[PDB]
Symmetry: C2
Subunit: 209 residues, 2 copies
Amino acid sequence: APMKLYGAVMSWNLTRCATALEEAGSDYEIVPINFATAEHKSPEHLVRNPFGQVPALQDGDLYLFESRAICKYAARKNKPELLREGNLEEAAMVDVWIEVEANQYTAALNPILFQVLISPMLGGTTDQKVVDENLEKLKKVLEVYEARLTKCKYLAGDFLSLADLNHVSVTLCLFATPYASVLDAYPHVKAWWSGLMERPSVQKVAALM
Amino acid sequence: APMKLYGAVMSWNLTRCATALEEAGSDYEIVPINFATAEHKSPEHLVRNPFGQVPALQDGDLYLFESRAICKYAARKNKPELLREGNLEEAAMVDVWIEVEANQYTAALNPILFQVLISPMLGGTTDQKVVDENLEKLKKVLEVYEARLTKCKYLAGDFLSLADLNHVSVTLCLFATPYASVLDAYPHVKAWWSGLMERPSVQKVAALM
């Protein structure tokens, strides 16, 4: 009955899946994968993800991988309204913004979250060089989000969709560091992020970390 | 009035859309964008793509950007069979592989295409180091594609889907480098490519280049 989500809760890619599963109201549980013992590279795991990585989802005998693919499925199966399937124009927007998150927002955030967050916990120091330039890249993205959110309640339009939830796992991480002050320069992105932060699904996900 | 695909035929992100538009029998028209004139950063283009990039698609009054989203749109609008909409398990399978193209296949192929094809065109030289390194990363993906293609007729199952088509533009470019031979060690992957190559849709985009 419950779908098994494979991966350690410390990965923001698995929590991207947890966000959608929590919102669609899916029956699921997490199964941690230890990287220390190369568990992700075991034969049992390779039948779930041939590329040997997490996340991986199992629904009965159905195996899925790639966080964003796992996300569309949980909505597609439990809360399709998050995909606006049925309305062509609306569904097109959700896709447009699901791609922007991956190719724009997160792409600028990734270098940052590592320097400011992962690197130090592994015993390293933060490279300001990298942080500074990526903050510029992200800055230009937030200006667009700012205009977008001035005209629309949410990213895909006046409704919540997968485009929105897909941004929480990385943003929650950003919000745990002193760089959360970059959102203050964009009132609408800020308001938007607060609205999302109220949702129980988001609070649970934040709790998983 | 035909759809408008904005951008130069030269970019494979642009032609990725053409492949989808072609196969869906979409009535479209290519509208070049000259970067030399910062035309992509013109206020006119900024209405089509807030990020000032190509491709951008116009359908009457609808405006879409980000290639893989434009692709889903044309398929959903003119050929929903490519998405396998009505089958939860099949649609999920399509999504998984649409991500694999972007996150594994083209992730390894892009660096090589820039070095071998773009760099020299601009007036530079190919850095073999990055060609060999990414060539290694690619083989690891190919051996998994090989395994998949033995079990299934196509990537998402025994049916052609957008997942397959989305690999057209970049692979087409690979077949324009001395590296097109890598596929020879991967029989099912090679057969799969040859099967696709015989479609008029891929023959039309190849012509566009």
